[PDB]
């Protein structure tokens, strides 16, 4: 995906301020709460009975951290997302058979979490730049279906 320099600047500047220990878990937790069918893929995580249970679940925070790392990795290779996400594409598509619509949903939940954390700093143009990024990541993760 192609970001303008202004967009690259906006994205990289905000990402530097991201709490990398927490934001990933918050996005994954919210995915499980807002789109409950996704819980089908995480039965080994234990207590997902309430929103409070989900957000406080140690396995959700831990796994969310790995997700966020992958997004960070993507932000470093915006010009080669397909190669960056090849192994993860095989995992989510060939092994897990996650419908790719859910890649888009997680991306949009991440965008909501970034808005929540950054407030007025998450301007409409900054959002537009992040939408290009999460669309690119979702498309790359879905490549094994293509």
């Amino acid at each position: 995906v192609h970001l303008t320099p202004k967009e690259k600047s906006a994205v990289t500047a905000l990402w530097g301020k991201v709490n990398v220990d927490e934001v990933g878990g918050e996005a994954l937790g919210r995915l499980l709460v807002v789109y409950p069918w996704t819980q089908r893929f995480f039965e080994s995580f234990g207590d997902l009975s309430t929103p409070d249970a989900v957000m406080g679940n140690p396995k959700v925070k831990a796994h969310g951290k790995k997700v966020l790392g992958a997004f960070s990795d993507g932000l470093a290779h915006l010009d080669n997302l397909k190669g960056t996400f090849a192994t993860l594409s095989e995992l989510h598509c060939d092994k897990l058979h996650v419908d790719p619509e859910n890649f888009r949903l997680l991306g949009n939940v991440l965008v909501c979490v970034l808005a929540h954390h950054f407030g007025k700093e998450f301007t409409p143009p900054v959002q537009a730049a992040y939408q290009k990024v999460v669309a690119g990541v979702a498309n790359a993760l879905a490549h094994k279906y293509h």
Partner: protein
């Protein structure tokens, strides 16, 4: 279907929006036009630049429609019937676009109301906006 907790959550969160209702509607539209440029084509008679009086005025209309839906949440098809006819028949709005505006409204609420945007309320608001979207797309014929 919206649960009792969902309706409580949506009413409470929307209560906090207040006099900012129209402003937030305008901001959601702006977010949508910038993030998803395909949506701009529905508004050729609009100047969609930042600070546009037309986007401001339209944001108020959107917000007032959502407020009507909140106020009549158990009777939304009836409450929104006229708007459903408009969007589906006259305007021929692609159903995909309601998901895009719904997302931009959630982002707007998250950016302005951090205390209210809990995971539970996020879920309720998403369900509410999906319900509104279902009504507004119910009239293609």
């Amino acid at each position: 279907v919206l649960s009792p907790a969902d309706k409580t959550n949506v009413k409470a969160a929307w209560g906090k929006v207040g006099a900012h209702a129209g402003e937030y509607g305008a901001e959601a539209l702006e977010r949508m036009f910038l993030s998803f440029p395909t949506t701009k084509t529905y508004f050729p008679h609009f100047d969609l630049s930042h600070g546009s009086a037309q986007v401001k005025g339209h944001g108020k209309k959107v917000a007032d429609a959502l407020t009507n839906a909140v106020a009549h949440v158990d009777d939304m098809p009836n409450a929104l019937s006229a708007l459903s006819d408009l969007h589906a028949h006259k305007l021929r709005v692609d159903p995909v676009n309601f998901k895009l505006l719904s997302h931009c409204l959630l982002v707007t609420l998250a950016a302005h109301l951090p205390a209210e945007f809990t995971p539970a309320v996020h879920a309720s608001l998403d369900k509410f906006l999906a319900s509104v979207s279902t009504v507004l797309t119910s009239k293609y014929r």
